[PDB]
Each structure stands twice: as C-alpha cells, then as structure tokens.
Design an enzyme around this catalytic site. Structure first.
Site, mmCIF file in Angstrom:
data_model
loop_
_atom_site.group_PDB
_atom_site.id
_atom_site.type_symbol
_atom_site.label_atom_id
_atom_site.label_comp_id
_atom_site.label_asym_id
_atom_site.label_seq_id
_atom_site.Cartn_x
_atom_site.Cartn_y
_atom_site.Cartn_z
ATOM 1 N N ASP A 8 0.861 -1.179 0.000
ATOM 2 C CA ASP A 8 0.000 0.000 0.000
ATOM 3 C C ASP A 8 0.910 1.246 0.000
ATOM 4 O O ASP A 8 2.084 1.159 0.370
ATOM 5 C CB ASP A 8 -0.890 -0.038 1.246
ATOM 6 C CG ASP A 8 -1.805 1.135 1.351
ATOM 7 O OD1 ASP A 8 -2.537 1.403 0.364
ATOM 8 O OD2 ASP A 8 -1.772 1.774 2.423
ATOM 9 N N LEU A 9 0.363 2.397 -0.398
ATOM 10 C CA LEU A 9 1.140 3.641 -0.412
ATOM 11 C C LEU A 9 0.775 4.540 0.769
ATOM 12 O O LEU A 9 1.624 4.802 1.632
ATOM 13 C CB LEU A 9 1.011 4.378 -1.755
ATOM 14 C CG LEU A 9 2.100 5.427 -2.056
ATOM 15 C CD1 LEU A 9 1.961 5.870 -3.495
ATOM 16 C CD2 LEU A 9 2.046 6.648 -1.146
ATOM 17 N N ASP A 10 -0.457 5.025 0.823
ATOM 18 C CA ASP A 10 -0.813 6.064 1.789
ATOM 19 C C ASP A 10 -0.812 5.477 3.209
ATOM 20 O O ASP A 10 -1.510 4.501 3.493
ATOM 21 C CB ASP A 10 -2.178 6.664 1.422
ATOM 22 C CG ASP A 10 -2.255 7.098 -0.035
ATOM 23 O OD1 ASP A 10 -1.399 7.916 -0.453
ATOM 24 O OD2 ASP A 10 -3.174 6.636 -0.760
ATOM 25 N N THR A 16 0.688 10.261 3.602
ATOM 26 C CA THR A 16 -0.386 10.822 2.801
ATOM 27 C C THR A 16 -1.774 10.357 3.261
ATOM 28 O O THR A 16 -2.766 10.948 2.835
ATOM 29 C CB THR A 16 -0.177 10.528 1.325
ATOM 30 O OG1 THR A 16 0.255 9.172 1.191
ATOM 31 C CG2 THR A 16 0.862 11.469 0.715
ATOM 32 N N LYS A 45 -9.930 4.862 5.159
ATOM 33 C CA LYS A 45 -8.603 4.432 4.730
ATOM 34 C C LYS A 45 -8.747 3.218 3.813
ATOM 35 O O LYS A 45 -9.532 2.308 4.073
ATOM 36 C CB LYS A 45 -7.690 4.120 5.918
ATOM 37 C CG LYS A 45 -7.340 5.325 6.779
ATOM 38 C CD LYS A 45 -6.411 4.946 7.923
ATOM 39 C CE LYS A 45 -5.965 6.178 8.703
ATOM 40 N NZ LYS A 45 -5.178 5.829 9.912
ATOM 41 N N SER A 114 -1.700 0.010 -4.643
ATOM 42 C CA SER A 114 -2.405 1.190 -4.156
ATOM 43 C C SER A 114 -3.654 1.473 -4.979
ATOM 44 O O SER A 114 -3.676 1.346 -6.203
ATOM 45 C CB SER A 114 -1.502 2.421 -4.200
ATOM 46 O OG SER A 114 -2.168 3.601 -3.737
ATOM 47 N N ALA A 115 -4.689 1.912 -4.281
ATOM 48 C CA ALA A 115 -5.910 2.412 -4.887
ATOM 49 C C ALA A 115 -5.715 3.797 -5.514
ATOM 50 O O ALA A 115 -6.580 4.259 -6.252
ATOM 51 C CB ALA A 115 -6.997 2.505 -3.820
ATOM 52 N N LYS A 145 -10.544 -2.052 -2.967
ATOM 53 C CA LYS A 145 -10.481 -2.509 -1.554
ATOM 54 C C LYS A 145 -11.810 -2.244 -0.830
ATOM 55 O O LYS A 145 -12.355 -1.156 -0.981
ATOM 56 C CB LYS A 145 -9.324 -1.827 -0.800
ATOM 57 C CG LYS A 145 -7.934 -2.097 -1.358
ATOM 58 C CD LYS A 145 -6.828 -1.274 -0.689
ATOM 59 C CE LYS A 145 -5.541 -1.354 -1.488
ATOM 60 N NZ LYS A 145 -4.424 -0.603 -0.859
ATOM 61 N N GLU A 169 -0.014 -2.861 4.927
ATOM 62 C CA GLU A 169 -1.221 -2.031 4.946
ATOM 63 C C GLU A 169 -1.372 -1.292 6.264
ATOM 64 O O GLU A 169 -0.968 -1.799 7.314
ATOM 65 C CB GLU A 169 -2.465 -2.896 4.708
ATOM 66 C CG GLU A 169 -2.944 -2.870 3.264
ATOM 67 C CD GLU A 169 -3.662 -1.583 2.871
ATOM 68 O OE1 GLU A 169 -3.914 -0.720 3.757
ATOM 69 O OE2 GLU A 169 -3.985 -1.467 1.667
ATOM 70 N N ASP A 170 -2.003 -0.119 6.204
ATOM 71 C CA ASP A 170 -2.372 0.654 7.386
ATOM 72 C C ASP A 170 -3.886 0.731 7.604
ATOM 73 O O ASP A 170 -4.316 1.439 8.512
ATOM 74 C CB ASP A 170 -1.821 2.089 7.302
ATOM 75 C CG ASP A 170 -2.493 2.910 6.216
ATOM 76 O OD1 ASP A 170 -2.678 2.351 5.117
ATOM 77 O OD2 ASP A 170 -2.877 4.080 6.468
HETATM 78 O O1 LIG Z 1 -7.152 7.937 -6.297
HETATM 79 P P1 LIG Z 1 -6.870 8.825 -5.078
HETATM 80 O O2 LIG Z 1 -8.005 9.795 -4.848
HETATM 81 O O3 LIG Z 1 -5.489 9.477 -5.214
HETATM 82 C C1 LIG Z 1 -6.765 7.811 -3.607
HETATM 83 C C2 LIG Z 1 -7.728 6.672 -3.372
HETATM 84 C C3 LIG Z 1 -7.584 6.018 -2.026
HETATM 85 O O4 LIG Z 1 -6.187 5.578 -1.955
HETATM 86 C C4 LIG Z 1 -5.919 4.841 -0.770
HETATM 87 O O5 LIG Z 1 -4.568 4.491 -0.854
HETATM 88 C C5 LIG Z 1 -6.202 5.702 0.464
HETATM 89 O O6 LIG Z 1 -6.012 4.923 1.633
HETATM 90 C C6 LIG Z 1 -7.617 6.210 0.406
HETATM 91 O O7 LIG Z 1 -7.734 7.118 1.571
HETATM 92 C C7 LIG Z 1 -7.863 6.949 -0.854
HETATM 93 O O8 LIG Z 1 -9.219 7.428 -0.959
HETATM 94 F F1 ALF Z 2 -2.191 3.647 -0.895
HETATM 95 AL AL1 ALF Z 2 -3.639 2.870 -0.179
HETATM 96 F F2 ALF Z 2 -5.133 2.143 0.444
HETATM 97 F F3 ALF Z 2 -3.438 3.741 1.383
HETATM 98 F F4 ALF Z 2 -3.964 2.011 -1.699
HETATM 99 MG MG LIG Z 3 -3.057 3.145 3.270
#
Ligand SMILES: O=P(O)(O)CC[C@H]1O[C@@H](O)[C@H](O)[C@@H](O)[C@@H]1O
Ligand code: ALF
Ligand SMILES: [Mg+2]
Ligand SMILES: [Mg+2]
Length: 218
Positions: A8-10, A16, A45, A114-115, A145, A169-170
């Site tokens: 995962d990233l954020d 982030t 999250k 990552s999403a 997710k 993951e967080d």
């Molecule tokens: O596509 P984005 O809007 O950059 C992020 C889409 C999702 O990513 C995930 O990694 C985060 O945990 C979520 O908080 C976020 O909503």
């Molecule tokens: F980077 Al994430 F859920 F935090 F895909």
């Molecule tokens: Mg995360």
C-alpha cells in the site's frame, strides 16, 4: 521464503493518509457534513475516491445529483493534488527506503498495490519509482479494496503467487483485501484500529527485511 512484497502507499510509504483525511474532512464540511473525524476516517482508509465520497454522504443520509457527486470528487482530488506537490524524498517513512533496497538485494519482487490514481506521481516525488518492479493500475481492476483484486493484480504483475507474498497495509479495508488475496498481511498502526488477529507493528521502522523473514518463518 516469500517472493514478493505488495505495498500500500498512503500511510505505509509516506504520511499521505493524513492528507487524504484532511482533504476529505474539508470536503465533507463544505457540504455541511461533520462526522468525518479520525475515528470515522478509519472506515475511509484504503477506500477508493468515489467510494470514500459515498461513505461520507451515507454517513449523513445525503442525496446529491450525479453532476454534484462528480464535482465533489474532483474538488477533493484537486485540493489533495495541491497538498502533495511538495512531497519529497525527505517524506518517505522510516525504514521504507532501506526495506526497498534490502528486498532488491535479496531478489524479492516489489509491487505497488495502491488504490490511488496519484500513486505514480507520489513515487516520482519521493524518488522511489526505480524500486518498484510493478505498479498495479487501480483503474484496471474490476473491484477496489476491501476486495482483493488490487493485491492479486500486483502479485501477478511481478509473476509471484499471492500466497508467496507479504502485503503491507495501514487500513481495515486493505488488511481484509490482503487476507482475501491469500497473501500474508502485516499491518502498521494500532490493533484497536486494525485488529488483534494479524501481526501489527506500531510504525514503519519495524518493516525490516529481518522482521518480514521473522514473521514468514512464523
Ligand atoms: O485515487 P486517489 O483519490 O489518489 C486515492 C484513493 C484512495 O487511496 C488509498 O490508498 C487511500 O487509503 C484512500 O484514503 C484513498 O481514498
Ligand atoms: F495507498 Al492505499 F489504500 F493507502 F492504496
Ligand atoms: Mg493506506
Ligand atoms: Mg523503473
């Protein structure tokens, strides 16, 4: 031995998750919904952009037009994208850069699960792109997710079975996604948030290759 780590990233690679929270809360309040506090944010999250907005609307029983829904998601993203312009290598979380180096030295594949559609931009900001063998495109999967699809795609992209992978993951949603992929989850955060049934570490300094091996050997 495990053959891939699926990141995962954020909230795992950098802080982030905090920025997504601040941006979503600002959005929610602009539309008169103030239930988006840190406790509620644990349900956001890991969740996609559109799914996050829907959860915020549902919290309030609120019913916006399709046009407004699209505008709100775009507004939040535009704000978030402004927030992250100054992200740099100094913002990489403790342990993460060294982990990436150590994984590559041990021939363990590295994939982003990552999403975030802002993922590639963030890895470039942090000078991390070259560590990744693959980035699973979150626009390509049929389900986000807590569905496992993004972790399955990340593992496939590096030629490794999910069952021979570790996921980091967080989030509650992401931990469930890892479980259902067949990979082994190691969470970062509080067990109060992430559960008492998987390995959880309090901060990312704990994510060392030595510890991933310790856990895998199990
Ligand atoms: O596509 P984005 O809007 O950059 C992020 C889409 C999702 O990513 C995930 O990694 C985060 O945990 C979520 O908080 C976020 O909503
Ligand atoms: F980077 Al994430 F859920 F935090 F895909
Ligand atoms: Mg995360
Ligand atoms: Mg490259």
């Amino acid at each position: 031995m495990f053959k891939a780590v699926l990141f995962d990233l954020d909230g795992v690679i950098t802080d982030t998750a905090e920025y997504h929270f601040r941006a979503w809360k600002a959005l929610a309040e602009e539309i008169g919904i103030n239930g988006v506090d840190r406790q509620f944010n644990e349900q956001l999250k890991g969740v996609s952009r559109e799914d996050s907005l829907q959860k915020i609307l549902d919290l309030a029983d609120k019913k916006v037009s399709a046009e407004e829904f699209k505008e709100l998601a775009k507004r939040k993203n535009d704000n978030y994208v402004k927030m992250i312009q100054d992200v740099s290598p100094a913002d990489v979380y403790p342990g993460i850069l060294q982990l990436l180096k150590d994984l590559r030295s041990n021939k363990i594949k590295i994939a982003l699960a990552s999403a975030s559609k802002n993922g590639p931009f963030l890895l470039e900001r942090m000078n991390l792109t070259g560590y990744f063998d693959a980035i699973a495109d979150p626009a390509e999967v049929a389900a986000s997710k807590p569905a496992p699809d993004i972790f399955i795609a990340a593992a496939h992209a590096v030629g490794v079975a999910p069952s021979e992978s570790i996921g980091l993951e967080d989030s509650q949603a992401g931990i469930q996604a890892i479980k259902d992929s067949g990979a082994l989850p190691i969470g970062v955060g509080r067990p109060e948030d992430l559960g008492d049934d998987i390995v959880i570490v309090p901060d990312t300094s704990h994510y060392t290759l030595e510890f991933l091996k310790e856990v895998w050997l199990q």
